[PDB]
């Protein structure tokens, strides 16, 4: 009768509702509630994520309106599907992820009212390059002071999916709460239709990018390649032959030998091949 | 070690690494590094001060 290793099943539209609401008010700590379904002991799912109307207080238990939620939940019973909340979320743009002074209290109020109520922290100012630092957490009780926390029993995936970094284990890990693993519920009827409407172009794959700027682009690159070739000429004729293998390894440039020599040459080669082949095909097709 | 700079972690304020060479910012004014500008015989007349 204890936890081992839970797994949070998030949906594709769940995280999309998380990023847009987090990006919406960035300097005002957006705050909403997480709605899912406890399917068994140690797997938990969430498909539908709604937001909450915020207040002057901010992320707290007071911004959670009870009469708005039950009015909202009742109207969701007839449209879509009725279910019970399984947690909450908030946004910490000022730092990474850890449970704040009042985040731990509203966690206690939710796991006393609901069952376990996993809290999700999303940093909207970090989800920028190609990755998101979304993490969820779960409070452990203070009664297990003589037993080691995270009662893992039959699992070896816990070394994966994140290790606790120095910016995480300073605030509350692992003595207050613990981390949890989250995977992505990918399936068909969602994934291929997202790709075919985002990264897909029908009329664009056969255009010609008319040759005012096209052959013009094949001229500014020849000059800088020539100077690199003359610089490549300068090093190859030079040929220091006193202690060569140490002089080569302590004096690297990472731009002379083959870095700036074939990079643009490859780019100019592929572009005119694509351009001429698309030019030849339309001459085969169009009369 | 006197005037020993160290790398401090910016989260827990823990030591990271003993740092190398001592405090010398703005040595661009220092160490002129160019030896020839003028010879000795182009002064003349002031040999006592020399």
């Amino acid at each position: 009768a204890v936890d081992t290793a839970e797994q949070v099943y998030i949906s594709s539209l769940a995280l999309l509702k998380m990023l847009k609401h987090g990006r919406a008010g960035v300097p005002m700590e957006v705050m909403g509630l997480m709605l899912g379904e406890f399917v068994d002991d140690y797997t938990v799912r969430v498909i539908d994520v709604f937001a909450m109307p915020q207040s002057g207080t901010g992320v707290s238990v007071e911004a959670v309106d009870p009469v708005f939620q039950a009015k909202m939940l009742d109207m969701l019973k007839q449209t879509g599907r009725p279910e019970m909340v399984v947690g909450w979320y908030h946004s910490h743009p000022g730092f990474g992820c850890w449970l704040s002074g009042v985040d731990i209290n509203t966690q206690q109020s939710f796991e006393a009212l609901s069952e376990r109520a996993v809290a999700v922290v999303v940093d909207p100012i970090q989800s920028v390059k190609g990755k998101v630092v979304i993490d969820a957490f779960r409070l452990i009780n203070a009664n297990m002071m003589v037993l080691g926390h995270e009662p893992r029993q039959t699992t070896s995936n816990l070394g994966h999916l994140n290790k606790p970094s120095i910016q995480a284990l300073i605030h509350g890990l692992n003595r207050h709460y613990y981390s949890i693993t989250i995977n992505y519920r990918k399936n068909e009827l969602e994934q291929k239709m997202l790709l075919n409407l985002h990264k897909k172009s029908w009329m664009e794959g056969l255009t010609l990018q008319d040759y005012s700027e096209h052959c013009k682009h094949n001229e500014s690159v020849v000059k800088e390649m020539l100077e690199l070739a003359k610089n490549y000429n300068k090093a190859v004729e030079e040929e220091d032959k006193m202690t060569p293998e140490q002089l080569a390894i302590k004096n690297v440039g990472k731009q002379d030998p083959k870095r700036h020599l074939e990079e643009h040459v490859d780019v100019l080669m592929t572009s005119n091949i694509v351009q001429c082949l698309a030019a030849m095909l339309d001459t085969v097709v169009f009369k | 070690t006197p005037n020993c700079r160290v790398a401090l972690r910016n989260d827990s304020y823990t030591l990271h690494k003993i740092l190398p060479n001592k405090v010398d910012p703005l040595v661009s004014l220092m160490m002129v590094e160019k030896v020839p500008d003028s010879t000795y015989e182009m002064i003349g007349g002031l040999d006592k001060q020399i």
Binding site: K129, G130, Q255 | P20
Partner: protein
């Protein structure tokens, strides 16, 4: 994955960020730079940047979070 790695290093460095100044160099792939908001830092460099460009205390680029040489 090698093409993912080139794209990763490309988009890691073309974002709005602060401008700092080179101060000193420890060794290969680690240097001592400080911001223009004071409070001298200690970060790593990227291997793209030519090492024969920071002898003086010249203006460099610093990330907001990693605060590394960009």
């Amino acid at each position: 994955e090698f093409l993912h790695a080139q794209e990763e290093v490309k988009r890691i460095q073309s974002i709005p960020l602060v401008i700092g100044q080179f101060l000193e160099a420890v060794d290969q792939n680690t240097a001592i730079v400080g911001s223009t908001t004071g409070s001298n830092y200690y970060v790593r460099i990227l291997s793209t940047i030519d090492r024969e460009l920071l002898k003086p205390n010249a203006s460099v680029a610093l990330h907001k979070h990693s605060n590394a040489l960009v």
